[PDB]
Design a protein around this ligand. Structure first.
Ligand SMILES: CCCCCCCC/C=C\CCCCCCCC(=O)O
Length: 131
């Protein structure tokens, strides 16, 4: 997982409104989210990964072991059961709640971190660059 480690800043986003709307996020939160450029920090300490997402709007932090389920409260206030694994060199984060699922997939492509978010028919792509 070592190539994912570091500090990353958002530089491009496509279809995030569609993804938020699919999750039921209200229009006022979508407004602010469309103008926010988060910083994501990924760190490791032995087998424990910590993923921080910082912005002027909301901040989140989770710590987990790969392949072990954990409880997570998301930035939009869903209480989900999560698991993160490495699949084909990608970091795959699966969230389940109320019979629903969403995936947050991170892959490294030409030095950039590409985050693909899928829920329902909505697919959002967010591109991060390393700081
Ligand atoms: C912590 C800041 C995340 C981005 C601004 C706040 C958005 C909150 C609205 C819906 C959350 C949807 C699920 C999390 C999206 C994370 C996107 C990302 O890491 O770039």
């Amino acid at each position: 997982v070592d190539a994912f480690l570091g500090t990353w800043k958002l530089v491009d986003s496509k279809n995030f409104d569609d993804y938020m709307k699919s999750l039921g996020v209200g229009f006022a939160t979508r407004q602010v989210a469309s103008m926010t450029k988060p910083t994501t920090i990924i760190e490791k300490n032995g087998d424990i990964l910590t993923l921080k997402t910082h912005s002027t709007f909301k901040n989140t932090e989770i710590s987990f072991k790969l392949g072990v389920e954990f409880d997570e409260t998301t930035a939009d206030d869903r209480k989900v059961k999560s698991i993160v694994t490495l699949d084909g060199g990608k970091l795959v984060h699966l969230q389940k709640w109320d019979g629903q699922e969403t995936t947050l997939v991170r892959e490294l492509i030409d030095g950039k971190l590409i985050l693909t978010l899928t829920h329902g028919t909505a697919v959002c792509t967010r591109t991060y660059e390393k700081e």
